[PDB]
C-alpha cells in the first residue's frame, strides 16, 4: 500500500510518522492526498513498536 510503504520509509529515514511527513512523501510520489486514509494510518500506528511488528507473520 502507498500509505504502508510511506510509513516504513519514514521510520527507516528516522522521521516521525505523522500527517505532515506522510503527506510530503505521498505528494512526492504524485498520489492525491486523502484526509481519511493517512489519518487512520497515523491512528493505527499510534502506540506501536514498528520494529517488533515488522518481523513475524506466518
Amino acid at each position: 500500500s502507498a500509505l504502508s510503504y510511506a510509513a516504513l520509509i519514514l521510520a527507516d529515514s528516522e522521521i516521525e510518522i505523522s500527517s505532515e511527513k506522510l503527506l510530503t512523501l505521498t505528494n512526492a510520489a504524485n498520489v492525491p492526498d486523502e484526509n481519511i486514509w493517512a489519518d487512520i494510518f497515523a491512528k493505527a500506528l499510534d502506540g506501536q513498536n514498528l520494529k517488533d511488528l515488522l518481523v513475524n507473520f506466518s
Partner: protein
C-alpha cells in the same frame, strides 16, 4: 611507418570531441584478454557506441573537462592503470558492466603475472612418456611415474590468488593444457553526470536487493496484516487476526464450548 604524425594535438583533438559527444565514459583494462577476444568484445560495443585512444594522450580528460564544467583535478585519484582505454557510449552504466564483465572469453595464464584466483592442478595421467618429471616436482606439483607415464599424485594449489605465478610455473601448466581465467575488459571506472563510480559499485549485487525487496515487501505486508488498513492485499489476513486470537484463547484455557 615513417616519421610523419603519429599525431600530436590532432588525435587529442579528435578525442576531445569524443568525451563531449557521449554521456557515459569508461576507463577499461585490455591487458589480460586475447585480441580475438578483445576485438570481438569491441564488436559488441561498436554497434552501440565506440572506443578511442590514448597514453597520457588519454589523460587529458582535464581539457575536455575544461571545455565544459565537469571535473579536473577534482577526481579522487585519476584511476588509470596499465593498459587503459576509454569507452564512450550512450549505454547506461550498469548495463555496460553486465555486457563486458559477464561475457568474457577464456585463455591461458602468463609467467610473472599475479594470479587473479586460485590455481589448482588435478591428479591423473598427463599421458606423457618418461622424461624430466623433475620439472613438475620443482614447482611443488608431486608426480611420480606410474605405468610408464608421468602422473600427478594429487590435486593441490600451485599458486594462490594475489601471489605471482613463477616463470617455470606458467610454462609447465601450459604443457599440461591447463589454463582457466576469464578475460575481457576489466572496468576500472565510470563517469556519468558529475559522478565517479569505482569498481566495487560496478559489480552490481542484485540478488541481495531481491532479498531486501522481498523482506521490505514482508515489512509492508506485516504492517498491513497486523495493523488492519484494508486496500487490496492485506484484507483477508486482517480479519483472521481477530479470530486467531479468539480460537486461541480456547487452547490454553479449560472452558469447553
Amino acid at each position: 611507418m615513417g616519421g610523419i604524425r603519429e599525431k600530436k594535438a590532432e588525435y587529442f583533438a579528435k578525442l576531445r570531441e569524443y568525451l563531449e559527444e557521449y554521456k557515459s565514459l569508461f576507463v577499461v583494462g585490455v591487458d589480460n584478454v586475447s585480441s580475438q577476444q578483445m576485438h570481438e568484445v569491441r564488436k559488441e560495443l561498436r554497434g552501440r557506441a565506440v572506443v578511442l585512444m590514448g597514453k597520457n594522450t588519454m589523460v587529458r580528460r582535464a581539457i575536455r573537462g575544461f571545455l565544459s564544467d565537469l571535473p579536473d583535478f577534482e577526481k579522487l585519484l585519476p584511476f588509470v592503470k596499465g593498459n587503459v582505454g576509454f569507452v564512450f557510449t550512450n549505454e547506461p552504466l550498469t548495463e555496460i558492466k553486465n555486457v563486458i564483465v559477464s561475457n568474457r572469453v577464456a585463455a591461458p595464464a602468463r609467467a610473472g603475472a599475479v594470479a587473479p584466483e586460485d590455481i589448482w592442478v588435478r591428479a591423473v595421467n598427463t599421458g606423457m612418456e618418461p622424461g624430466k618429471t623433475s620439472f613438475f616436482q620443482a614447482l611443488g606439483v608431486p608426480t611420480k611415474i606410474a605405468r610408464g607415464t608421468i602422473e600427478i599424485v594429487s590435486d593441490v594449489k600451485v599458486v594462490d590468488a594475489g601471489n605471482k605465478v613463477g616463470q617455470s610455473e606458467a610454462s609447465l601448466l601450459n604443457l599440461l593444457n591447463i589454463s582457466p581465467f576469464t578475460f575481457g575488459l576489466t572496468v576500472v571506472q565510470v563517469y556519468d553526470n558529475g559522478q565517479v563510480f569505482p569498481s566495487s559499485i560496478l559489480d552490481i549485487t542484485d540478488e541481495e536487493l531481491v532479498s531486501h525487496f522481498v523482506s521490505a515487501v514482508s515489512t509492508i505486508a506485516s504492517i498491513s496484516l497486523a495493523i488492519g488498513y484494508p486496500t487490496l492485499p492485506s484484507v483477508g489476513h486482517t480479519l483472521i487476526n481477530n479470530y486467531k486470537d479468539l480460537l486461541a484463547v480456547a487452547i490454553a484455557a479449560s472452558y469447553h464450548y
